[PDB]
């Protein structure tokens, strides 16, 4: 659900080249929770 | 069906042909046609 | 087992339980009408008029970019571009209706142009059993809606016999893949060939 959200978020502004502030800050506080959900399933699998 | 008859009333007992090798006194499907 | 790109499908609906498939004439009488297949014990049906195949399954509106500008796995939510096997044409909808009843019931046909304005028809499930991104398969529930028009393929309940319309009426469909991508030299059901050993021919009522 996250990747099919942010993939269409990217496909929404692929037409404009230079991207401005608040859209990429909305990108930033989404990739900041992506920062932790990306390893929250890795400390389920690095166990022996 | 032996010559051709109409497909308006062509039924199962009239037109049903089949293919066999030589039959004695007796996913997708299996690959048997060459 | 599961659906992928480039399967010869046939769209079923069920209305006595009547089994109905959507047919295609081609080269004249462009608005396409149906043919029954529940009564196969008294009529041989025609399936070459309704071999339908899709080859492109892009995203929800992935041609956002291309309207201004191997075989992939399709999902629930993704778009369909259809193709016939007889006409080699694309399935679309025309905006001039043949209903003459002012109920906003448009009728579909096939278009020689390759413009993806009203030839793209995205996919949606019926119930909450499957959700967005789920696994498409045989024998499922289907709801199909367009992009630039977005009306649903339904059956006629107003007058005459039954035919397919595009209005605000949601009728469930069935995908039904029939022929997959099989190898060369190996015949499947619905391929023309000849029986040489002599040719199996008809003379010039010529029966």
UniProtKB/Swiss-Prot annotation, chain A:
Record-listed Ca(2+) binding positions: 43
PTM section of the record: The N-terminus is blocked. Channel activity is modulated by phosphorylation.
Domain notes: The calcium release channel activity resides in the C-terminal region while the remaining part of the protein constitutes the 'foot' structure spanning the junctional gap between the sarcoplasmic reticulum (SR) and the T-tubule. Pore opening is mediated via the cytoplasmic calcium-binding domains that mediate a small rotation of the channel-forming transmembrane regions that then leads to channel opening.
Additional note from the record: Binding of [3H]ryanodine indicates that the heterozygous channel is activated by Ca(2+) concentrations 4-fold lower than normal. Single-cell analysis of cotransfected cells shows a significantly increased resting cytoplasmic Ca(2+) level and a significantly reduced luminal Ca(2+) level.
Recorded family membership: Belongs to the ryanodine receptor (TC 1.A.3.1) family. RYR1 subfamily.
Complex formation: Homotetramer. Can also form heterotetramers with RYR2. Identified in a complex composed of RYR1, PDE4D, PKA, FKBP1A and protein phosphatase 1 (PP1). Repeated very high-level exercise decreases interaction with PDE4D and protein phosphatase 1 (PP1). Interacts with CALM; CALM with bound calcium inhibits the RYR1 channel activity. Interacts with S100A1. Interacts with FKBP1A; this stabilizes the closed conformation of the channel. Interacts with CACNA1S; interaction with CACNA1S is important for activation of the RYR1 channel. Interacts with CACNB1.
Protein name: Ryanodine receptor 1
Species this protein is from: Oryctolagus cuniculus
């Amino acid at each position: 659900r996250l990747q099919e959200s942010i993939s269409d978020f990217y496909w929404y502004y692929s037409g404009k080249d230079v991207i401005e502030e608040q859209g990429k800050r909305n990108f930033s506080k989404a990739m900041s929770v992506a920062k932790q959900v990306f390893n929250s399933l890795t400390e389920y699998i690095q166990g022996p | 069906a032996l010559v051709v008859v109409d497909a308006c009333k062509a039924h199962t007992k009239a037109t049903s042909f089949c293919f066999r090798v030589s039959k004695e006194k007796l996913g997708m499907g299996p690959p048997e046609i060459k | 087992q599961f659906l992928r790109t480039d399967d010869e499908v046939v769209l079923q609906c069920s209305a006595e339980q009547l089994k109905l498939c959507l047919a295609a004439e081609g080269f004249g009488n462009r608005l396409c009408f149906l043919e029954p297949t529940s009564n196969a014990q008294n009529v041989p049906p025609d399936l070459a008029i309704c071999c339908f195949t899709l080859e492109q399954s892009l995203s929800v509106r992935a041609l956002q970019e291309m309207l201004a500008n191997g075989h992939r796995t399709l999902l629930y939510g993704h778009a369909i571009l259809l193709r016939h096997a007889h006409s080699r044409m694309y399935l679309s909808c025309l905006t001039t209706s043949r209903s003459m009843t002012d109920k906003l019931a448009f009728d579909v046909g096939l278009q020689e142009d390759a413009t993806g304005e009203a030839c793209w028809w995205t996919m949606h499930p019926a119930s909450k059993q499957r959700s967005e991104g789920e696994k498409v398969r045989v024998g499922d529930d289907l709801i199909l809606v367009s992009v630039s028009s977005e009306r649903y393929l339904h059956l006629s309940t107003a007058s005459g016999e039954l035919q397919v319309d595009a209005s605000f009426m949601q009728t469930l469909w069935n995908m039904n893949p029939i022929c997959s991508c099989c190898e060369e030299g190996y015949v499947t059901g619905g391929h023309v060939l000849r029986l040489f050993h002599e040719c199996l021919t008809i003379s010039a009522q010529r029966r």
